[PDB]
């Protein structure tokens, strides 16, 4: 769970993440962390990258998502790991 205050943090995705977000219809350069997480979840569902049987497993070795996270797969249960991977791919506004 991202804290309520952290959800409204304004961020500028780096180019690969921005490309991912725009492929599912995002249309700006600046987002809240909450918005980034909405579009990422949507992306994973649109590309059907989750295991249908154990739906916390995401496979991304042959996908853009694997290129920007730098991993071949991950578990949605790894909250810290995911936040770390996402933060590597954006600049926090004014930081």
């Amino acid at each position: 769970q991202i804290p309520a205050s952290e959800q409204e943090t304004l961020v500028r995705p780096k180019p690969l993440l921005l490309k991912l977000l725009k492929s599912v219809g995002a249309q700006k350069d600046t987002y809240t962390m909450k918005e980034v997480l909405f579009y990422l979840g949507q992306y994973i569902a649109t590309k059907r990258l989750y295991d249908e049987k154990q739906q916390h497993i995401v496979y991304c070795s042959n996908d853009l998502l694997g290129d920007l996270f730098g991993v071949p797969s991950f578990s949605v249960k790894e909250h810290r790991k995911i936040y770390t991977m996402i933060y590597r791919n954006l600049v926090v506004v004014n930081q």
Binding site: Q1, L37, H56, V76, I82
Partner: peptide
């Protein structure tokens, strides 16, 4: 569980 629910818990 659904991917939707796991991701919503992450969010």
């Amino acid at each position: 569980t659904s991917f939707x629910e796991y991701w919503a818990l992450l969010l």
